[PDB]
Amino acid sequence: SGAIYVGNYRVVNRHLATHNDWANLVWEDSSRDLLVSSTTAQGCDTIARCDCQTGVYYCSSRRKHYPVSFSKPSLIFVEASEYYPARYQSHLMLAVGHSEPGDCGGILRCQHGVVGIVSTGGNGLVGFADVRDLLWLDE
Ligand SMILES: C[C@@H](C(=O)N1CCC[C@H](C(N)=O)C1)c1noc2ccccc12
Ligand SMILES: [Zn+2]
């Protein structure tokens, strides 16, 4: 579990979005596993605007932060689940690191700010849904 709070927006994994998230929907993309809802309170997270391939992510299954090298956002195959059929997930970045079900929503940050959130993993890998291209989150 976990979300990014920037301005009047809340960014969450689309498969974990609540009734309130869907009732206050701004944008969602099943292919990216992202959903953005509106909030009344102001969010103070800062979004990174860069091409960093190194950063630190929060791993709830270890209650720890880990430094990682991660790939550029790309289309990657993702197996079926109670949330999606087998498909390519776009804007996804992989890293070698620990992650297990329950870790989705963990933030990945670089020195510039928030890069993305945990969305996939297993087998000694962790996948992050990138948010750096969503320039509208700032305005
Ligand atoms: C269950 C599998 C997974 O990635 N899912 C389920 C949840 C939805 C994911 C998706 N993006 O479509 C696919 C998984 N394996 O290891 C992990 C580690 C972190 C996080 C999710 C996992
Ligand atoms: Zn950066």
Instruction: Report the residue among 104, 107, 108, 123 best suited for mutation to probe ligand 1: largest number of ligand atoms under 8 A from its CB.
Output: 104
Amino acid identity at 134: L
For ligand 1, whether the C-beta of 95 sits within 6 Å is no
Judgement on whether residues 34 and 82 belong to the same structural domain of the protein: no
Judge if 21 and 58 occupy the same domain. Answer: no
For the chain, helix, strand, coil in percent to 5 are 10, 55, 40
What are 108's strand-pairing partners? 57, 116
Residue numbers of the domain that contains 49: 45-139
Helices (H), the chain: 19-23
Tell me the β-bridge partners of 11: 4, 36
93 shares a domain with 26: no
Quick check: is 29 catalytic? no
Residues 54 and 92 both lie in one domain: yes
DSSP state of 86: S
| Residue 60 and residue 119 in one domain | yes
Q: Pick the atom of ligand 1 nearest to 79's CA.
A: 13
Residues 105, 13: contact at Cβ < 8 Å?
yes
Task: Clarify whether residues 30 and 53 are in a common domain.
Answer: no
Q: What is the resolution of this structure in A?
A: 1.7
DSSP string, 46-83: -B--S---EEEEEETTTTEEEEEEBPPSEEEEE---SS
Edge-to-edge strand order for the sheet containing 34-44? 4-13, 34-44, 25-29
Q: What contacts 118, CB < 8 A, 6 or more positions away? A: 2, 13, 57, 99, 103, 104, 105, 106, 108, 126, 127, 128, 129
Give the chain's domain count: 2
- The angle formed by the CA atoms of residues 114, 63 and 20, to the nearest 5 degrees, is 55
Q: Tell me, yes or no, if 15 is annotated catalytic.
A: yes
